Amino acid sequence: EVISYGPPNVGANENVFGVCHIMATWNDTFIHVTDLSGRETLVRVTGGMKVKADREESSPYAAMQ
RNA sequence: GAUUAAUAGGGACAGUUGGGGGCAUUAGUAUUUAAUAGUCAGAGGUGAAAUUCUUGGAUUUAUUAAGGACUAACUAAUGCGAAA
Ligand SMILES: [Mg+2]
Ligand SMILES: [Mg+2]
Numbered sequence: 572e573v574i575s576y577g578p579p580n581v582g583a584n585e586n587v588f589g590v591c592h593i594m595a596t597w598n599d600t601f602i603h604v605t606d607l608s609g610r611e612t613l614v615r616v617t618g619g620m621k622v623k624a625d626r627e628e629s630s631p632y633a634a635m636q
Numbered sequence: 637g638a639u640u641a642a643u644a645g646g647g648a649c650a651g652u653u654g655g656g657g658g659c660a661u662u663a664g665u666a667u668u669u670a671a672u673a674g675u676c677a678g679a680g681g682u683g684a685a686a687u688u689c690u691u692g693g694a695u696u697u698a699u700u701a702a703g704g705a706c707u708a709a710c711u712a713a714u715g716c717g718a719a720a
């Protein structure tokens with residue numbers, strides 16, 4: 572089934588807190604989650620990942636995706 | 637036998653005032669770099685782009701450290717200095 576290598580013991584009440592470092596440049600955008608320490612990185616997405624055009628790198632469409 | 641004592645000037649003294657100067661000290665993020673951890677495929681830059689950087693892992697994230705600069709914001713029809 573689903574083996575989520577995330578945290579062992581949760582509940583529906585519980586909050587699981589990640590931290591999102593977001594960098595916005597006129598030339599791009601970065602959405603980066605880590606733990607509360609900032610050490611261990613979970614997810615990484617840049618605008619340029621989501622579009623092939625150099626100019627669209629920053630744009631809201633890209634940021635959304 | 638020595639004119640006043642200039643809202644003339646020099647000097648003394650008293651509480652201040654100042655981003656004036658010279659030495660020492662000392663901080664602060666920031667840029668750049670390095671280290672140690674992470675994670676991955678793109679970062680940069682532009683009107684678009686291309687030179688660049690990138691899997692030898694960049695950009696990115698956390699913690700330190702090195703090294704030169706620089707004193708933000710408060711900061712003003714405010715201050716000081718002969719001007720710079
Ligand atoms: Mg330092
Ligand atoms: Mg220093």
Ligand SMILES: [Mg+2]
Binds near residue numbers: 714715
């Ligand atoms: Mg003043």
